[PDB]
Ligand SMILES: COc1cccc(OC)c1S(=O)(=O)Nc1noc2cc(Cn3cccn3)cc(OC)c12
């Protein structure tokens with residue numbers, strides 16, 4: 001409780017209960033503006049709002065844009081209502097999402113699929129503005145209708161582009177959602193294989209690989225292990241180069257292609 005939500009052209013059954021107002025949460029189906037994330041108690045209110053509401057995208061600037069794909073760097077201190085609203089939408093699918101009110105100390109990277117009707121929210125990741133114990137992601141969500149389409153990979157990749165460019169290796173803030181866990185593993189496997197191919201006949205340390213990727217060392221060894229590509233050199237965890245697996249991935253990659261892929265050249269601003 002809540003049970004179902006009306007988001008744009010979709011009706012979505014919630015997986016979890018999100019702390020909404022006592023009167024709004026009680027409702028069977030909760031109505032929402034796919035651009036402003038404002039919750040309304042009826043189908044009729046929604047339609048009245050969709051005539052008034054001038055929003056056809058999130059209340060922020062595009063840190064990224066390539067074709068129909070956009071990343072909106074939404075500052076929690078600036079458009080605070082929307083971000084608090086986003087956290088409430090988030091908590092309907094993310095079990096471990098604790099922060100819903102004090103959004104001002106955070107950043108929200110909002111992924112959108114763009115067309116004539118506007119900038120349709122696909123999902124998001126949140127990042128603390130100043131985190132010494134550096135977690136490049138606190139939360140990461142993908143609306144079910146978008147899950148497994150590769151949008152989740154895109155965010156993970158974008159979070160690492162941000163974190164790696166500012167010199168430090170990063171990780172998501174555990175415990176992840178099981179689909180978040182599953183998407184991070186898929187990413188690490190592809191990245192390491194693709195990165196080892198672009199070295200090809202060049203021996204690289206787990207430390208240098210972590211520098212090139214932005215993935216923290218522990219995440220690399222557990223992934224190399226799963227890839228049946230890990231070993232020891234005393235005080236040194238090492239890469240077993242199964243060169244047939246590296247060439248085969250690259251082959252399938254040219255074939256199947258990437259539908260959503262981060263172009264570092266399409267960023268408006270990257271750190272230093
Ligand atoms: C399972 O992930 C796969 C797996 C295979 C292929 C594939 O792409 C072809 C992908 S994904 O690349 O599309 N990523 C995601 N799909 O669903 C996700 C869901 C979440 C979290 N969540 C929990 C509730 C709402 N959201 C996070 C995600 O990634 C960060 C993804």
Ligand SMILES: [Zn+2]
Pocket residue numbers: 033035036037038049053055
């Ligand atoms: Zn609105």
